[PDB]
Structure 1
Amino acid sequence: AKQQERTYIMVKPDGVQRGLVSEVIRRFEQRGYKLVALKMKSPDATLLEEHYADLKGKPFFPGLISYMTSGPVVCMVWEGTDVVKQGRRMLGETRPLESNPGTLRGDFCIDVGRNIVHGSDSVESANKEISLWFTPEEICEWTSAQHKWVYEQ
């Protein structure tokens, strides 16, 4: 069951605009994490408001939703051991100015509000996010040919 952990990764509108979709996918793909769902979407405010439900009511919330509807996003689900936490380490710290070289934000970003990508903060949050952005039918079950070389039996 451990290798079956999943996380939700989203390239934010700035990531798409700046031509960083392939780079975000590369960090996960080259690591041995398995891509099990993927779509480009122009979500409406209602969907984004549920994604960010924990931030409702905060003064910056309306601006956040407006910004998140200003361009398309790329939604992904990745599967593998500890992918939630590893996913977060690969993105960098929330603030690019605190992120290290070698991370996505540390390599490509400057402002916290333009930090190109979102990753689930916990397995529980991942499960919520995955079900919000994808139907079960959109999640593609497959077995990697490199499984026995990425994981110990």
Structure 2
Amino acid sequence: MPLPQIYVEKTLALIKPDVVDKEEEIQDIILGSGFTIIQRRKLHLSPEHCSNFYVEQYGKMFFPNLTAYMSSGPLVAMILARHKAISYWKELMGPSNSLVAKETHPDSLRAIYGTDELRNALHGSNDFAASEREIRFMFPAVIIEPIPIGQAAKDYINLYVAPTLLQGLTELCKEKPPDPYLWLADWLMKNNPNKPKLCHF
């Protein structure tokens, strides 16, 4: 961070199916406030997706209405980014509970568009690490974080990748197959420890 490099702060920002119809006004206020939108995408989270998206807090937020309000129609997620992105987005939002924001923050977007505690118009990152977690969930294959140049990449590989890759390459060495990449890649697909074995018969 005190590198030669210079830094962009990024935050997730959602609109629920009872507010998606007013996507355009919300995006207008977002752009006018000084944010820059990196990517749009239209979602429709099934309850399995809802259980995984709040997985940091789904073990405490036992709200079936909260799953329905993500599943009862499409969503509009965005990456927003500007100078102090998360705090400025929080300032526009206000309190997370819209029932408090309606009376105490007239300027809040949640007061303007939201309805109540669970029918909150907007959801976004409440923390930078939470920002990386939710953005890596919802929009795969988008670089958002500092790159782990040093030992952190080695730890990542040794904890996730190496315990499978070592053993697969070891069997590839026993067989010595032709065009070895098929053997490695099909082996990794078939015997992934993080997934079940699929028998297409």
Give the TM-score range, shorter chain.
Answer: 0.7 to 0.9
- Is 2:108 aligned against 1:106? no
Q: Name the stretch that deviates more: 92-101 or 53-62.
A: 53-62
2:132 aligned partner: 127
Q: Which amino acid is 1:62 matched to?
A: P
User: Which residues of structure 1 form unaligned runs of 5+?
Assistant: 140-153
- Asked whether the equivalents of residues 39 and 76 of structure 1 are also in contact (C-alpha less than 8 Å), the reply is yes
Alpha carbon RMSD of aligned pairs, Å? 2.2
1:79 aligned partner: 81
TM-score by length of 2: 0.61
Greater C-alpha Rg: 2
2:56 aligned partner: 54
Of 94, 97, 100, which aligns to 2:96? Answer: 94
Task: Give, in whole Å, the separation in 1 of the partners of 2:128 and 2:61.
Answer: 28
The alignment-based identity, stated in percent, is 27
Written as runs of structure 1 = structure 2, the 5 A alignment for 1:25-36 is 25-36=27-38
- Asked whether the equivalents of residues 11 and 85 of structure 2 are also in contact (C-alpha less than 8 Å), the reply is yes
Structure 1 runs of 4+ with >6 Å offset: none
User: Which residues of structure 2 form unaligned runs of 5+?
Assistant: 145-201
Cα displacement (A) at 1:77 = 0.1
TM-score by length of 1: 0.79
Q: Using CA pairs below 8 Å that are at least 6 residues apart, which structure has the higher relative contact order?
A: 1
Task: Give, in whole Å, the separation in 2 of the partners of 1:93 and 1:2.
Answer: 31
Cα displacement (A) at 1:52 = 0.7
Secondary structure at the aligned position of 2:18 is classed as helix
- Asked whether the equivalents of residues 136 and 142 of structure 2 are also in contact (C-alpha less than 8 Å), the reply is no
- Asked whether the equivalents of residues 14 and 77 of structure 2 are also in contact (C-alpha less than 8 Å), the reply is yes
2:24 aligned partner: 22
Cα displacement (A) at 1:62 = 3.3
Q: Which amino acid is 1:107 matched to?
A: I
Q: Which amino acid is 2:122 matched to?
A: V
- Asked whether the equivalents of residues 9 and 81 of structure 2 are also in contact (C-alpha less than 8 Å), the reply is yes
- Asked whether the equivalents of residues 2 and 81 of structure 1 are also in contact (C-alpha less than 8 Å), the reply is no
Give the count of matched residue pairs: 137
Relative to its length, the structure with more strand (as a share) is 1
- Asked whether the equivalents of residues 3 and 80 of structure 1 are also in contact (C-alpha less than 8 Å), the reply is no
Of 43, 61, 67, which aligns to 1:41? Answer: 43
Q: 1:4 to 1:66 in 2, by over 3 A?
A: same
